Structures are given as structure tokens and as C-alpha cells.
Amino acid sequence: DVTRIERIGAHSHIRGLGLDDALEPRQASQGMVGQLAARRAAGVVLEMIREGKIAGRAVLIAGQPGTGKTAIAMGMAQALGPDTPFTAIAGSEIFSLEMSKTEALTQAFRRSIGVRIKEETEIIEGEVVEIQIDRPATGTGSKVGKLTLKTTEMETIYDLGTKMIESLTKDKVQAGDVITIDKATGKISKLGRSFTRARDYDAMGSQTKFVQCPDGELQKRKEVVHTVSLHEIDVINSRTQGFLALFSGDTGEIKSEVREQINAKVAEWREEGKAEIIPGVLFIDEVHMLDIESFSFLNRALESDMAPVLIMATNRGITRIRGTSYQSPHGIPIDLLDRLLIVSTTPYSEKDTKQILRIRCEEEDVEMSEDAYTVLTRIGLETSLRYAIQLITAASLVCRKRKGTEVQVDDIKRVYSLFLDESRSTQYMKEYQDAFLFN
Amino acid sequence: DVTRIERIGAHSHIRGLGLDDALEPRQASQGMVGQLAARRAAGVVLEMIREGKIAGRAVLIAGQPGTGKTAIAMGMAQALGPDTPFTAIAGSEIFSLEMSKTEALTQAFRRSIGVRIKEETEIIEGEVVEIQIDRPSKVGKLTLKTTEMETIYDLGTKMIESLTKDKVQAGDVITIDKATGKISKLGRSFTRARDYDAMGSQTKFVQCPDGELQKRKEVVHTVSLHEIDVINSRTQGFLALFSGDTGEIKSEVREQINAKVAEWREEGKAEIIPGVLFIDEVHMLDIESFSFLNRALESDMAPVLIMATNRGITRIRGTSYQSPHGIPIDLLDRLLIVSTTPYSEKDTKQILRIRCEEEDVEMSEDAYTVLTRIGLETSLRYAIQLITAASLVCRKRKGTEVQVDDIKRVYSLFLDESRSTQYMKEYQDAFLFN
Amino acid sequence: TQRIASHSHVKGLGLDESGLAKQAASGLVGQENAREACGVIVELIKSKKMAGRAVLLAGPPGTGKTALALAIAQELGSKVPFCPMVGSEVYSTEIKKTEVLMENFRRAIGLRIKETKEVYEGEVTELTPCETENPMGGYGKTISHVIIGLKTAKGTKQLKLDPSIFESLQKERVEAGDVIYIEANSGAVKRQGRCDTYATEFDLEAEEYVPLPKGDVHKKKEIIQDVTLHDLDVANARPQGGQDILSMMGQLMKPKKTEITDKLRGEINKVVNKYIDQGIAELVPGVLFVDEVHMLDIECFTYLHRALESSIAPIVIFASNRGNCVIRGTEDITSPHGIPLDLLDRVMIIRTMLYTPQEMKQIIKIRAQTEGINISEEALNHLGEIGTKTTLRYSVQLLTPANLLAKINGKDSIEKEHVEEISELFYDAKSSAKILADQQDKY
Amino acid sequence: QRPSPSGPPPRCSVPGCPHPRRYACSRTGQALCSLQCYRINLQMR
């Protein structure tokens, strides 16, 4: 019943590439059907990326519109995992008014090579019993105090220096609270008030949720895993106490010297064994839109030893390159085109279009009759697959309107008559030649 | 002798729109000649504006050059008069470098909607005479003086502190708002302008306030909606009202402003008065900006747009398409075209007469005949400009009345478009770039 | 009274229980198939299941495509966000187009979260630092708590407070006669000012007085607030605090839109997912309506490509009125509706047809009645004929000036003479174009 | 503590005028309200 932020989109059924241990694609597995050769090549490049030893490798996926190129991209993104950085950028997400195209491409590249750091700290989680503060009268500003912690098994009393006292006062910690103390940095994280200590209370000075008491020993160890991209390290080191630029995106055209310094420091960090560098994948979709200067910057930037495994995508033919007047395959100059492997996709058939419709209905929880499936497949062959996929939800809604439970051919015909296709819309469009604008 | 900042312009000889009680134009009234149907339509749309019941209305004025579209717009503005917002801008004024063409039109829309509000104001204003304090909570008193009374207030400790920080001295004219308690020094009295022979960095001498001292009354404030937008745009946005530093105000603020204004009008606290937005030379707007007016005229609060266009069937700016008036068809239907007509010979004499009496120039009958012939064979504006030079040339002759010879001399000295073009082709090689 | 807009009468699609379109209901006449499709779209939006589905209303100018979007908005209600847009809003001098589009996409998704407010407020009367009578070793006393008396228009009551609050009381100017308020959850103290009761003990006081509070001393209520997902973005991008040179410096400088990074969204999504899983906040997807889409750019369309298949994007309704036009941003790549074919395969097209004279006359009558205008049949038929000659907009627009002319003549309704005079005065697009063509030599 | 308040607010010294005391006069030193009562107090003294 509850609706989370993630809804059912166009590629919400693909949970992977559906490959066996022998890297042989199956006819129908993990939401992907058909397109055997492209799935094979994608599995090869996925294993290659997983190994992660060679850098600056590019792969282009080309084919007809609506033949699964973006589907393959999402499939390999899901199969790669959550802990391996993956960046999806459209073709126009680099033409910015705040930084140059080359700068945007550099940021996109550096955003894909992640650094994993395991941070283990010693912490003290416990319930507050009482706090002792001994303010000086005059003196020189030196403060002294004590702090008693208690758990269900053990308890202790700690002394306080001149540094954590100000933090405790800033966080306004009192009796009856459960706190976690970070021994290394010195921060105080607030969990909540206890139960028994709440019996003796003044008027409401703190009204919030409730928590229990940390059982076991008072002192424990905590571990966090941080995955930090190179670009945000660059942004951090580009200015003092600059961290909102990670979210604000205000840093523009960072100085290169910072970039080589970060590269060197990451090299030493890898050597010392503290942090681990993991290359990621960049996916530029609809890359025909990139200006020629962007392509030529890609040429040189792909020869570095820290470049990611960028994946291209294009559905154009012999078209002139944007910003120029020269024709070329895929709208890409031969220079970049000569530095990567090209994977092509084949048009779909009836047998696998039917299975695509079936898995889409399974994802959307829609039931149709076999005759309805046949009619939908005929529509999705006379007309593109996207239209047939879209008609499923409308047919299900129309069926539910009449208090039905199984979608029928009449509902599908009704929806087909109600909405329109591009071809039929253009056909009806020719008879209003003078009624439209700028024909 | 004394010349103000404003003087005789080109459209300063018209004062309102010449009409009747039944919206029937007169042949010559309030500095207007002819254009009977155009003036009738102008009066109808002026009544529409005055009622202010319907929102999002557009009227276009089209015609040949020199027929009086801008004159009709200025006459409408004068007839409407003040107390009703009237924002007049040119077509090319929105091509800014700090805000897009959308914002430069959104702000031009929000600047033609007035809000009338009523406020209760009590203010004390007068010349201070003596301030006395004691040292026991310090207690003191202060004396105000005007042309009528002389009074003493027993002010509190906070007022003592404020007065000490503001460094008030005798002879100063100050105003205090007892609702809040803020001192606004206005300067020093004239009679107190001699005890110092070396005045400080910034001092002003103003007359002592007269009348009653502590005035309590009600005031009316007419504020544009654009000001309310700019104020909430940033933390201290009222500076941008004069600086022009505002740019791309967030859309989550204008909706809040509209909701609050609707709530206020429901409560009766404030009332909304619509206005007029005049966009002269609209024939040169962007195809992107034209499409924005499609959804701008369909809002609950929007002014009445009045446009002028000198173009026939011409290319639209921003696209390679031919359209009438240089305006897309999807917008022209929302408008309501009011056409004009070239003036006749009688209209030409009757229009040069008004300018002659506006410039305080006496002209002869044969001089009027020759001038009318010239203004018919040439543009009307050239003949209009031909009278100011004629007066100066006649003054050089030391004569009080112009004649035909003076008009012929001025005609021979300066040139119109036709003769300039004709002489231009005679030696076109000497010119540069064709 | 609220002023009459150009789409005031549209109150809904006017559908049956079975979804069939009534001939004339809720201010809409005709377009039965379009109304049924819009009802299906309304059901889809209320389903709270799909994401990124798009519909394109295609038809000639002045056929009601804009009106149907507002009808969908009205039938949706007011608890679901509905963000309008034109095609010219993307072109900004402050930020890139794909960020204008991304911000708008994030605008059409709203939250709704509930919380409780607890406060002790009122006039202060006395401050009694009640002591425990038996100081501890090495000290002369042991203050136990502070007794604070607070009185409002209802009654007076005494509250026992932690001694440390006194340290805050001296931080501000907490004297008897002031009105204060303490937040139960926070625990701080703030002073509003002296009461109006003591507003007459002097003739000139530098402080402004506030009225005495009315109601109980301790107030506690429950409030539900709705924030769009774009508001969280701007809130997290620009932290509004005063205890910094950065916060204050940015708050002094001219505020500028900043291209929000995708990492910020990645954490906002996580936190809202956590709070939804805890049952505190309720997510409600909305609708984003782009009118005059033909003004977009090919880069904008190519970004919309990827934007639609997202699992978070809301439902988008496009509208356009162009024929076979050149796509903006290209040289001569013509396309229907000025929209690229590859994008146009991701949308469901809803066709809108012309209006028959009977429906045009019905629309004219509905507009006249909603506007508060009385018209005679012999004049209504003439107005409908005139509109059918030229267009619907030119017929509806002449309603008000005819009423003004009749009121000037004193009559309470429009007759044939008023309509014919108004039509003689004003002009339409066709006659004006004919005049321009005839007089092309003098323009 | 609470300082003791006063029951009736001060009133204009002229018996006819019921308005409160806006200010106190300078030449003679009595409570006053406006121009009219100031003129009355000036004349009656």
C-alpha cells in the first residue's frame, strides 16, 4: 500500500544481464530476453570491468531505436553492484553555463573512479546518570568535571578535559540520556532519553522519542565504509572548509595542479594499503549530441592511466557531426570511432516481443487473455514496442473501471481507439494542413 | 525663463483622449485630430481597463508610420491619469544580460498591478529644545517645539539610551513613531544655523515643523506587486528596487505572493487595481518570448496589454517564417487589432496648428498652406519638425511672424528622406560599402 | 470580487461513473474522446504506480488542449502538486537548461509530514530561584530549580524549570512585565517585549509593545506540512544560518541558482525513504504540464529522453500546436509538432479536433453566463455565426466590449446593434492580414 | 517581583476632554491631548 520514492519505470524489471557461469546468455532470465550477441558482448565487458586492470577502454552500442541499448546499460549497471561506482550522464548534461565542456567531461571522468576506505574507531555507547561541571569563578577559563556512565551490566566514571566539556554543553546533554562518545574525533551523537530516569522531570524542556539502554560492555568498536569519488576529493582540496560545493555544485574549472596532486596522493594511498582505489563505469547516453571539441577531448582523456571504462550509445546513421558539416558514421568523427569496440543490436521478432510483453505485465501486475496477448503483439509489430508496452497500463485501468479482473481484446481495442500512434496521428494530421502552424 | 526637467516633447501636446459621455470622439479636442474609429475603440478598451473585472486582455494598434499609434497610447495614458499603473516599455528593453527574456516580461507584468492598503499612523515631529536626565533606571524628560505649541515628554530609560546613542542636540528637528520608537533626524532649524561657523560632514537646514505635534490619522499606500516580489526575493531586497540587481526570482515566491494577496482581498484588508502594460514596437520580440505571452495572459491577475506594430507581412524575429505584423498566428487571435488610417489634408492642417500653439509659434495662412503641401508630399513628422527651425530662422531675421520665404529657406537647408536618397545615388561611389 | 480569467469556467471533465463523457458538464462541451482519455490519465495519476509516462495533446490552435490540462488539474484536487511550465522557461542566463528541467521535474513531487508543537508562553510575573535548604560540603547553598509564573488571558500558573535556564534568562533581558515563550522540545527562552498593559506608564519608550496572549499558557497542537522535493534541494544547497562568515557572506551577496549535483539527490532520496519506511511522511506524486513544448531545444529533448525512463520522474503532460515544423536547435530537420520522432515514440498522443457551430455557440453562452453577462438570442446567434466565420477566440473576446457599449446606451443586455458595432470597430487576424497584403507598399 | 500597577490611567487635565494624556504641557505643566486642549489650557491660565 505504501508508495516509496522508487516507482515502476520503463526499465524497472531488468535485474541484470541473465548470464550463466560460462558467460552464455539465456533466452529468458533476469528480465532480459533475446538479443543474444549484444548480451554476450556486454557480459564480456562486464567481466573485464570487474577484473579492473586496463584503463581508458571505450565501448559503443548501436542499433535501431527501441532495441534495448539502454536496457542493456541498465542491466549491466544492476549486475555490476551497488558498491561499484556507476555514473549515467545524458548527451546534453555537459553543456553548462558554469564550466567549460572539457571541464565538465573531466569532472564526469573523475566522478567514476572511487576510493574505498574502511574507518574503524573506538566508541563508548552508554546511558547518562549524572554530569559534573565545576565552572571557575575568575581564574583563566579552565574547567573541570566528571561524567558517570552506566549500562545494564557495568558502569564507570570518566574525567573530563577542557575540550569535550564545550561539546557537551553545545549539545545540551543532561541526565537520563543515551549517548555515543567518539574517542578519536570527540563528537557526541544523541540517541534519546531513557525510561526510568524520566520519572523525575521538571516542566517540558525536551520532548522527543524514546530509546532503550545499550546492553553489554560500555566500550566498543565501530566500523564505517566510505566510498569517495575522485571529483569530490578534488572539490574538497580545491578550497579551505569547502564542502557544500559537493551538493551546491558551485566549484567551477578547478585548477589542474590540484588534480595532479590528488592523483599522486591517491597513488601513495594505494601503495600504503590504507585505502583501495576501484575504477568505475561511465555511461554517456545519446552521445551523438556531443560537440566535436568534446569528442576530441575524449580522444586524449581516454589515454590516461586513471580514465574509466566509458560506454557510448547512439541510434543515428550517416549524420553530420554537431558543430561541423562533415558526415560520419554514428555522427562521430573517425578518430574517436577508431579507439573503441562497436556492439550492434538486431531488431526484435514476434516470439520475443510476446515474452517482453509478458514480463512487463508480470512487473506491472496485469493479466490478459491469450487473444489479448496476440492482439497486443500484432500492435507491437505493426507499431513500435514502446507503444505496446504503454498500452498495458491503460488497458488495465480501463478493465478495472468496468469492475473487471482480466483484460480482454475489447478493452485493448478501446484503448487503441482512444489514444493514438505517431503514424496514425500523422495520417490524421495531413487533413488539417491549413489548420496547423507553419507547415 | 525657468526651465524644469521636462519640456516640449513630441507627444506633450496631447492631454487625455478626446471623447464624450457616450464615448463619441470629437473632431478636435484635447489635442487630437481625426482617428474617430481608433479613438472609439481606445475609449471602449479604456472603460474595460477602468472597470477591471476581466483579466488577461490584449489590444493591438496597427497602421502606417505617422498615423498616431503611439499618440493614441499616450492619450490613453493621460486620460487614465495617475492612481492606475501604466508601465510603458519598448520592444527591445527585455534583452538583458542578468535576466532572461522570461523574467524581463514577468517583472513587467507584475509591475502593472497595484495594491491599495490602509494604515493607521501616529507620528510626533518637532524641534528639540532641551533634554534633561538624572543620575540616581535613569529618568529624564525631553521638550519638543513647533509653530503652535511647546511640550515636554517624560520618556523612559530605553529612550534615554537611544537618544544618547543617536547623539541628539538642541536645535535638531526629529520625528519619532510612538508605535515603534525610532528617531529619524531630519536636520537643524534655520534659526539654529549660525552657532557653528564650520559645518560638519553632512548637515541640513530645514524649517521648523508647524501644526499639531502628535498627528494620528489614516494613510493609503499603493504598492506594485513587483515591489512585494523583490522585497521577499532575498534577505534585504529593497535595495534591488533601485539598484536593478534583482535577477530570476524563484517561482515559489510569486505563488506565495499571489496567495497572500488573494487572502488579503478576501479579508478586505487590501484591494487590487489592475493596470496597463504598453509594449511599443512589439514587432521585434523573440519567438521564444511570444510563446511566453500565451500562458501569461491566462492568469487570474494580469494587466491589459497594448501593443504597437509598424510591420506588415514580414519575417518573425528568431525564426524563418513570414507572418502578418511579425507576430505568430497562435497569439494574434488572442489580441484585438485596432487599425488606423492615413490623415487627410484637413487633418494635416488641423494637426500642425496644435503643435504651433504648443510651441507658442504664430504662422501665416500661406505658410500653413505650403507646410500642409510639404507634409502631404512628404512625411508628417518632417513637416512637424519644420516649424521649430522656422521659428529660429525668423528670429534671426528679427521678425515676429513667419512667412513663405522663411519656410522655403528652412526647406532648402535641411533635407528629407526622398531628397537625401536621390542625392545619395548621384555620388554613391564616394560612399562606403555600397 | 475575484477577477474573471480566461479559463475560469473550466471546473472538470464531466464524466460518468462508467467514464463516458457527457455532452456538456462542468463547463466543457464536446471533445468526448479527449475527455475520456484525460479521465483515464487522471486514473493513472491517482494510481500511484507508474512514473515518467507522458501524454501529448495535439490539435489546432484554439481547440481546448490548454483547457483540458486545467480540467485535469481541477479534477485531481489540491493535495497533489501540479506544476505548469512553458517551453521558454528553460532558457536561463543563470543556469543550464537540463537543470531547469531537472528542478521542475523535482518540483512536481510533494511530501506531507506531520508533527506536534508544544510551547509554554505568556507574561512573566516573578522569578523565584527556589533553593534546597541544606547546602553541600564546601558551598553556601544548593539551588534546586527556578519557579516561573506565567499568566495569559485565561489564567496564571507556576512552572518549575531547570536552574540552567536562569543562565539564559540573564543572556537576554528577562524582567517582570515581559512576555516570553519556551519551546518544549527545544528548551530555549526568547523575549518578545513588554506587555501592552504597561504601554501608558511613559510618554516615549523606545520599545514597541505587544498584546497580552489569549489562550492557555501551555499550548500543544498537531500540524501537517507539505513540502515539494525541490524545496529540500534548495534548503540543503544553501544552508540558512547566521553564525558563519560563509552563510552570512552568501546571504549578503546576490543569490544565484546553482546546478545541484546528483549526489545531493542520492542522499535526500535515502533519508525520505527511511522516513517513509518509519511511517512518518507520506509521498504524493504529482503532474508537470509543459505547454508550447515546440519551443524546447534538441538538447532539452535529448535530456528528456533519459529523464522519462527514470523510476522517480512524475507524470508529464505535453501540449503543442505546430504542424510539420523545423526542430529548434537544428538546421532543416523537420518533424511533426516540431518534436523529434525518437522522443515522440515515448508519448501517448491525444488528438483534439475542431468545434462545430453548435458547440461554439454553447461555449459562447457558457462564457457569457460565467462572466455575468446577459445576451439576447438574436444577438447570440449572430455572434456564433461571426465566430464560425473567423474563430472561437474572436467571438468570445467581443462579449465584454458589447456589454460595455450596451451599458453605456443604458440597456441591460446586448442586442444586434451592439454586436455589429463592436465587430465594425475591432478587427480579426484574417481581415488585418488582408489589409496588410493590400497595403504592402506602405509598411 | 511585580511592581504595583495603577488603577486608572492618566487623563487630559481639561475636565471636558476624556482622552488620555498624550503629553504634559511645558509653560504651565499639565496633562494635555491635542491642539484644542492646549489652546484651552493656555487661555484659561
Ligand SMILES: Nc1ncnc2c1ncn2[C@@H]1O[C@H](COP(=O)(O)OP(=O)(O)O)[C@@H](O)[C@H]1O
Ligand atoms: N532484451 C530485452 N529484455 C527486456 N526488455 C527489453 C529488451 N529490449 C528492450 N526492452 C524494453 O523495451 C523498452 C524500450 O527500449 P529502449 O531502452 O528505449 O531501447 P533503446 O534505448 O535502444 O531505444 C524498455 O523499457 C525495455 O524494458
Ligand SMILES: Nc1ncnc2c1ncn2[C@@H]1O[C@H](COP(=O)(O)OP(=O)(O)O)[C@@H](O)[C@H]1O
Ligand atoms: N490623432 C492625433 N492627434 C494629434 N496629433 C497626432 C495624432 N496622431 C499622431 N499625432 C502626432 O504625429 C506625430 C507622429 O505620430 P506617431 O505617433 O509617431 O506615428 P506612429 O503611430 O506611426 O508612430 C506625433 O508627434 C503625434 O503627436
Ligand SMILES: Nc1ncnc2c1ncn2[C@@H]1O[C@H](COP(=O)(O)OP(=O)(O)O)[C@@H](O)[C@H]1O
Ligand atoms: N471543451 C470546452 N468547453 C468550454 N470552453 C472551451 C472548450 N475548449 C476550449 N474552450 C475555450 O476556448 C478558449 C481557448 O482555448 P485554448 O485552451 O486556449 O485552446 P489552445 O490550447 O488550442 O490554444 C478558452 O477560453 C476556452 O474557454
Ligand SMILES: [Zn+2]
Ligand atoms: Zn484634551
